[PDB]
Design a protein around this ligand. Sequence first.
Ligand SMILES: *Cc1c(COP(=O)(O)O)cnc(C)c1O
Ligand SMILES: *Cc1c(COP(=O)(O)O)cnc(C)c1O
Lengths: 402, 401
Amino acid sequence: NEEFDCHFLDEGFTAKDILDQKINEVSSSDDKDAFYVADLGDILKKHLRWLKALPRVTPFYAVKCNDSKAIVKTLAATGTGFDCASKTEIQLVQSLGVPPERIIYANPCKQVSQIKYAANNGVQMMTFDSEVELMKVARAHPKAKLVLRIATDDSKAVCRLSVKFGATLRTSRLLLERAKELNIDVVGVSFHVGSGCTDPETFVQAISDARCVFDMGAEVGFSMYLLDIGGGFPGSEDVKLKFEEITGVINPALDKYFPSDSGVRIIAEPGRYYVASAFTLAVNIIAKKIVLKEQTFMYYVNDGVYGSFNCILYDHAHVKPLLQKPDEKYYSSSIWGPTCDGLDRIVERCDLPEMHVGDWMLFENMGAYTVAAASTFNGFQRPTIYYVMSGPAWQLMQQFQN
Amino acid sequence: MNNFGNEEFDCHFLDEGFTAKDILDQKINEVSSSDDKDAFYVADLGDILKKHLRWLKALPRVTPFYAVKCNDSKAIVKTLAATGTGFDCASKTEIQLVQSLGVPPERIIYANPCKQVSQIKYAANNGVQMMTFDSEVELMKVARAHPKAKLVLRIATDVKFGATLRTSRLLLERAKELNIDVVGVSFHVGSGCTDPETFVQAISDARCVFDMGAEVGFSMYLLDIGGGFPGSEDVKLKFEEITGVINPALDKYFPSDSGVRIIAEPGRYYVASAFTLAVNIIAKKIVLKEQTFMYYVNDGVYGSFNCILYDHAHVKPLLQKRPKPDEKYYSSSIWGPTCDGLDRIVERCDLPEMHVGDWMLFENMGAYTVAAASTFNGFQRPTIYYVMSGPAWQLMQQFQN
Ligand SMILES: *Cc1c(COP(=O)(O)O)cnc(C)c1O
Ligand SMILES: *Cc1c(COP(=O)(O)O)cnc(C)c1O
């Protein structure tokens, strides 16, 4: 099974080199299905980077971003926690040998049978943001350790009037009093700034708001210790607001509002940060049209918006096709997926040299919210993932296991 | 009602005087005093037979080739195969599904104009000869991978697919140069079509390409009028209004004495109304503005309601029991189960106050729902319970023999 198969990445070779080699090796055949190269060493590099940038914050990987068994196994060996939102995610993480104390069930709105599943498997820490959730916990998981999820503002959200998750400060006070009345233990506060964050000061506001709810907790009689700063950190350098600019703003706020001597335990829920850059997708041009307007091209490829490029609809993705000479002419071009749906278009207009059927197009930074939400609509199967890892990366993972 | 092994090939009897709504009520009543309240579908295979009877009456000159991509349920494909439909397959996996149920390749049209070479080869390897195309590069691929194929030229309608009339002339000349046989013309007006006159113009364009093919020496006989027909009565432009415009155009441009064989590629028409989805309210918030409610249910935009993003769907939540005129309604939103702020299924609707454990129903959920669902965030696909009455089974027997 390719899911637990890992290939060696030789010294002085990058994931890009491996991609080029596989492409060369299938040159004279029609075995040209789309495929990923997934560098597990990149995930270890992200972990070293996290330990350096956020030394007080324990990462809990957001499984939904990419539930690859190889990814979860690599991060588990590294010693991360996991943010699970469903029975299936908890099952996946536990099947790889992760104990329940390394899981946070950070779904604020949980089906009762899934709350019971968590209780049956010893997963004690869950989030909530509503009184109905407290009633369900009192019935189905009364000894749970609850983390209150507070609202964060996103001034760029498409729907700012209706926010799916997060209690206001006023509601937070009423929730803490209600939890006390029901004899439910609230142990902390969580927030999630969201992947659309343009200003790191949003984290400062959320940390300040979390401190306010910690103070409310102390007033109601709770022993709050757990601060969860959520996710939304970028997974590549191809962004305006880079990881270390965010962390450089977070750390002074953590020191100010949650000093280490308070006994607080700080965690986060990064998803895309760990995995986005680790996956590169290669698709093959399977069909081609020339349209005179002067010369323009339509390229059809063997992954699309029902597959990996669902990220265009669900994840606000803007994808950048890359070629697998400076003087050669570029033409206005559109790129289409393989399904028989006129909506299955990946790129409306870009400039490309004339390409041909059998040529490859590459898409970097395809690890997060891609394969996790792909379907087999129209019968088109998911691209094979080839996992690679260098010897030195494997050795680094071994050091973490000890 | 519980499935017996795998849901795929399990079918339950629908007793005399019971409807799919009654079965849905019974299942809801059966789990009432428990927490096993996962979302589920009731799929009435007898509704697919009713659609088939309606098609034979409305379009008696047109052989239906079911568009598998709309809903690739094995139970649906087996029902329609026994009924004697053809199948429109776009990929190796869809061809494999149809052949696995015993359908011979002559009842398959590979109506994907832009096909991966290895998938063209798969079709050739399995005797699927009829394929569509709309480009010169496609002719080059067919010349190499499926040289004895019978090609159907897909034309543009009022743009991912479809050759203009000007391009169609060049493609016919090119096909002749490459010794590839072109046997007909196809078009697809699109599900978004509000004007049935689009079909008249498409049929006139198809006649023009037939005439162009006759000029270059082809024996054109296959007219394929595509899909886009509605699957429920909950539409402005109803099936029989469309067919009432199509039939006079077929008789005018393609009279029966010409030897033409006319087919179509209905997907949603056959299956939309056959599936009703029941979702459970798993979480609830009250928001004071004056009281409004937010309901969370256990299927969402990554599951069955992907139709909101991919299929232009406008979904209508229904209660098990039609409320009293006196009952107070509140402004309400409905959200899916995933930890994604975008997973919202209804922005604003009026509902009585509802509670965790209550069910909401969504009718007409057969087409472009389960076919494109994912298990994002670990949320599993709803169980489908297939039902069929004895009289529906008898009707299927009449079609099968
Ligand atoms: C999805 C999710 C995350 C991960 O988000 P990223 O943008 O991938 O970092 C973190 N926390 C919660 C509660 C989530 O639902
Ligand atoms: C999808 C498709 C159909 C089916 O469309 P419906 O709107 O479901 O009837 C028919 N023909 C072609 C070529 C298609 O791609």
